[PDB]
């Protein structure tokens, strides 16, 4: 058993509604107003073909920027300097206000929600995961602290290989609804998490998407809110965003916290703006100054043994669901496969959003090109 | 085989992407911008509890109206007199701009798209279905004309019982993704349609949801557009709507034309406004004056042998995906189970939208109450 979870609607029984019950009472009052949560659905446009390129200022310093964006399969690109949008690009077929999957940039949003609850004293990072989710007893999350989850410093038997059909990535996806279920698969994301094991060691960085979903589970146990609602209440609804975000949900309504958020490029930039404003957003404080300071400060460098990341960023690290370059600019970024970044450049008070669709989830090739663009654009923003 | 269908995106292979392939190239460029079409998804609200009742004018004539709306599980209710919203109600927990499932009011929208294509001379109602969809040869739709589909005048072995777990309604839903698939079920909506049989007789009204999905299939074959896009291009994008509508899609991306559209009450009223304006909408003409005239005129009364409908509306009929009361007011309505109506009152140049969630799909009890409210509100709009 995975214990108590937030009901899909007020008074809902556990796991209700399902695909076979949503038309029946009492479920249908909720379901008829939220059917996209149950059944795949398409937008029918209220609006009756070419790329939009408004790179403007940085164009003089980076003449070939649009070509470099094309070469990295860029769908949306936006630079926010202070409060001003100073450069934008959207590929043909993608509108400025269209939403785009964030992949693991979603993790940085989840970490922010956790941070807000730490500020409220509802989560203590020093406490074991099992203090908040007892049902993870007997799993790899039995022993580690919430901070070690936040920092991805738990050794786990989870092969985070995005291409291997047999990897835990795919099983994770089948459990949550991103992929077709097999018989014998865990019923939902919570159950999948309880199946994970490890050798018990901690302290070394191991990127594992399951960690973020454990954080979201903790958020639910501490607030009593569905993660989807907690993500709105503690973050999204304070941004003065143009559009709702969306997040995929599994068959219990649990949001795919580690990778399933979609939003517009401009709205994602509002998250970066909040970070560079010390944790304050138009709708109120999201996280404490201290939390933001710790994100910008980085994690333990010695924990970061990922050769690929450190080849590019020798003094890099990871903390609280953010990647920290440790470079001379102090760049920090949310990062997702296929080329998603929420990139912070504190030196110039700027945020860079790049949302892409590389053919491959992650390779040194795309990694080098992507980071080259983000660094060049950052430097182009420097006072001269 | 069900023949050629509009690709989910430009250049897509048949049936691509699937739940297991959408992350791979070339699918992922499209899928990352449209993930809700593949995986159930929840809105993360950008906005930070009680019913809104602004019944206003008609309140004096119908003092107990709000109670009557509550008693019929009303979620949204809106009266448009001319171009003016003169009464509104939304239950606690449902916002004025929230979308609501239309159930078979969706059919009236599909019929409108067909009507537009008839105006363009791309569909001839007198022609057999097989003129446009040859693959329906050998099925119950082999022989009948497109008009007989529009008018629901084909005898079909399809038990339209919304509660019986064993009825064709459920198989239809399993084929399309509204319900959990069983082994042996048709793979998609098109395949399900090809399995339908009948005794070959025509001319008598038989309400069958499959008919509308055949119409949507015809729309796709004649335009080359996904039904979702055709619904936008020929109708929704001409309404000057506040929000996109949505429609559920099956595993090929085919919209659930007969029941799967959701939209706001105010936007649905724009469809009624278009009908009462002779087929013209803010964005241009949607259908011809003649088409609208034929809808308002009704179908053959003798074909209408449904005792339930005619008990309430003795001179009632059905044509072109609209129910026609044949009453002294000439009321016509789109109708969906659990209490959805797009109700036209030409006498007062008014449209009534009622979107509800009755516990039961359809019973004489709810039918009597629902129609009593719509008729009383219509009469309350009369000049005195
Ligand atoms: N479970 C399916 C979706 C999971 C998303 C994974 C993801 O986006 N991972 C990001 C990896 C970034 C690696 C950065 C680096 O090594 O330099
Ligand atoms: N296939 C699942 C959804 C199908 C929707 C069916 C629906 O909305 N039907 C409307 C029936 C109206 C009957 C009106 C009357 O008999 O008076």
């Amino acid at each position: 058993s995975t214990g108590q979870h937030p009901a899909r609607y007020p008074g809902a029984a556990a796991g209700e509604p399902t695909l076979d019950s949503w038309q029946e009472p009492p479920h249908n009052r909720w379901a008829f107003a939220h059917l996209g949560e149950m059944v795949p659905s398409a937008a029918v446009s209220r609006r009756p073909g070419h790329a939009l390129a408004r790179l403007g200022a940085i164009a003089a310093q980076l003449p070939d920027l649009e070509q470099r964006l094309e070469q990295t399969y860029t769908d949306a690109f936006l630079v926010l300097r202070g409060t001003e949008v100073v450069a934008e690009y959207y590929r043909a077929g993608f509108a400025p206000d269209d939403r785009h999957l964030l992949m693991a940039v979603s993790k940085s949003l989840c970490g922010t929600v956790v941070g807000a609850l730490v500020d409220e004293g509802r989560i203590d990072p020093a406490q074991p995961v099992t203090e908040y989710v007892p049902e993870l007893a007997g799993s790899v999350y039995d022993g580690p602290s919430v901070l070690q989850v936040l920092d991805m410093q738990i050794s786990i038997d989870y092969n985070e290989d995005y291409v291997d059909p047999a990897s835990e990535v795919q099983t994770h996806g089948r459990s949550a609804g991103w992929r077709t279920r097999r018989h014998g698969d865990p019923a939902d994301t919570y159950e999948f998490l309880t199946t994970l094991r490890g050798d018990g060691s901690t302290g070394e960085f191991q990127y594992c998407s399951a960690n973020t979903d454990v954080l979201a589970w903790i958020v639910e146990r501490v607030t009593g809110l569905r993660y989807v609602e907690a993500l709105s209440t503690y973050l999204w609804a304070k941004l003065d965003a143009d559009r709702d975000a969306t997040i995929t949900v599994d068959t219990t309504g649990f949001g795919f916290a580690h990778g399933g958020v979609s939003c517009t490029a401009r709205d994602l930039a509002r998250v970066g703006r909040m970070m560079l404003d010390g944790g304050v957003a138009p709708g109120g404080r999201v996280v404490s100054e201290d939390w933001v300071r710790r994100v910008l400060a980085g994690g333990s460098h010695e924990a970061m043994t990922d050769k690929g990341f450190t080849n590019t960023f020798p003094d890099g690290s990871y903390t609280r669901q953010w990647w920290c370059t440790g470079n001379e600019r102090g760049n920090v970024s949310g990062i997702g496969i296929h080329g998603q970044n929420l990139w912070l450049d504190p030196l110039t008070d700027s945020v860079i959003v790049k949302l892409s669709s590389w053919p491959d989830p992650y390779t040194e090739h795309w990694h080098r090109l992507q980071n080259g663009i983000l660094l060049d654009v950052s430097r182009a923003l420097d006072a001269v």
Side-chain angles (χ1 to χ4, degrees), chain A:
Chain A
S1 66
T2 58
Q4 183 179 140
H5 304 299
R8 185 87 81 134
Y9 60 80
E16 293 285 7
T18 63
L19 202 52
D20 280 359
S21 71
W22 62 267
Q23 295 182 67
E24 307 166 354
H27 321 296
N28 57 9
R29 302 215 82 189
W30 173 82
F32 291 177
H34 302 88
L35 189 55
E37 283 211 34
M38 301 303 298
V39 183
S41 300
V44 181
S45 181
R46 65 182 179 81
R47 298 178 177 157
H50 64 286
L52 179 63
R54 302 175 68 185
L55 301 177
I58 59 176
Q61 298 161 283
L62 309 171
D64 294 339
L65 181 55
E66 182 170 3
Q67 183 175 34
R68 297 175 67 185
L69 295 179
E70 295 174 342
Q71 293 173 343
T72 52
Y73 286 80
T74 302
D75 301 318
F77 173 84
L78 184 146
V79 181
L80 188 78
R81 183 204 300 152
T83 58
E84 176 185 16
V85 180
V86 295
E88 288 186 274
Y89 169 91
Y90 307 92
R91 69 161 166 83
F94 190 94
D97 66 337
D98 281 345
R99 294 188 285 238
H100 192 289
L101 177 60
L102 299 187
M103 288 299 190
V105 172
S106 301
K107 295 192 170 70
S108 301
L109 308 187
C110 184
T112 302
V113 177
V114 174
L117 292 167
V118 172
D119 291 335
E120 292 186 344
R122 308 188 76 174
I123 296 176
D124 178 354
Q127 291 287 324
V129 174
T130 52
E131 170 63 16
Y132 303 104
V133 184
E135 286 78 7
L136 279 169
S139 76
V140 68
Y141 295 102
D142 185 354
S145 68
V146 176
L147 182 57
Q148 289 175 319
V149 179
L150 279 162
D151 286 351
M152 299 280 190
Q153 287 174 12
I154 303 169
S155 186
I156 301 171
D157 187 5
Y158 182 122
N159 180 17
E160 185 105 8
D161 183 327
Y162 303 116
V163 180
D164 189 344
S167 75
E168 277 78 12
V169 173
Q170 316 314 338
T171 303
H172 197 161
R174 292 195 310 274
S175 300
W178 269 34
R179 295 178 69 74
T180 301
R181 295 188 47 86
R182 302 170 181 171
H183 276 291
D185 277 342
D188 52 50
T189 307
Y190 308 113
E191 187 185 345
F192 168 75
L193 296 175
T194 66
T195 71
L196 298 176
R197 301 292 182 270
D199 67 10
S201 66
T202 58
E204 183 177 6
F205 177 75
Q206 184 187 319
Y207 190 86
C208 184
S209 287
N211 283 20
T212 311
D213 293 344
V214 174
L215 293 179
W217 193 350
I218 294 171
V219 170
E220 291 189 332
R221 283 297 287 271
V222 171
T223 64
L225 299 175
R226 296 179 66 203
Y227 178 65
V228 180
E229 181 170 348
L231 181 58
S232 173
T233 297
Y234 287 95
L235 176 57
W236 205 255
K238 301 186 174 182
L239 297 178
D240 190 24
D242 295 315
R243 306 194 64 194
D244 290 353
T246 64
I247 187 171
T248 64
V249 295
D250 71 13
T251 50
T252 72
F254 181 63
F256 201 62
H258 81 252
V261 179
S262 299
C263 69
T264 71
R266 177 64 184 89
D267 282 345
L268 184 59
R270 299 175 196 284
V271 178
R273 183 66 260 148
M274 174 272 299
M275 290 294 287
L276 295 185
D277 288 335
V280 179
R285 178 169 292 283
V286 172
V287 290
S288 71
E289 297 251 42
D290 180 74
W291 180 268
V292 175
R293 190 187 60 68
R294 293 176 183 267
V295 170
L296 293 176
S300 179
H301 297 191
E302 287 73 24
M304 175 56 67
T305 59
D306 186 280
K307 300 181 182 179
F309 190 68
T310 55
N311 279 345
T312 301
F313 305 115
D315 298 309
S317 64
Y318 184 103
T319 185
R320 294 167 170 79
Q321 305 291 282
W322 291 85
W323 294 84
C324 307
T325 64
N327 71 9
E328 64 183 334
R329 306 185 67 83
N331 290 124
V332 174
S333 193
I335 306 178
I337 51 173
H338 302 275
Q340 333 309 331
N341 286 83
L342 172 55
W343 173 278
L344 311 185
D345 193 54
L347 278 180
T348 64
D349 197 27
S350 297
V351 181
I352 303 175
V353 170
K354 188 174 186 291
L355 301 171
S356 317
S357 32
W358 309 333
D360 312 291
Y362 217 86
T363 66
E364 188 280 335
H365 174 80
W366 295 124
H367 170 92
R368 181 184 70 82
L369 289 173
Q370 184 94 348
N371 282 312
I373 292 170
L374 296 169
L375 290 165
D376 283 357
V377 174
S378 294
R379 289 189 280 260
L381 297 169
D382 281 342
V384 63

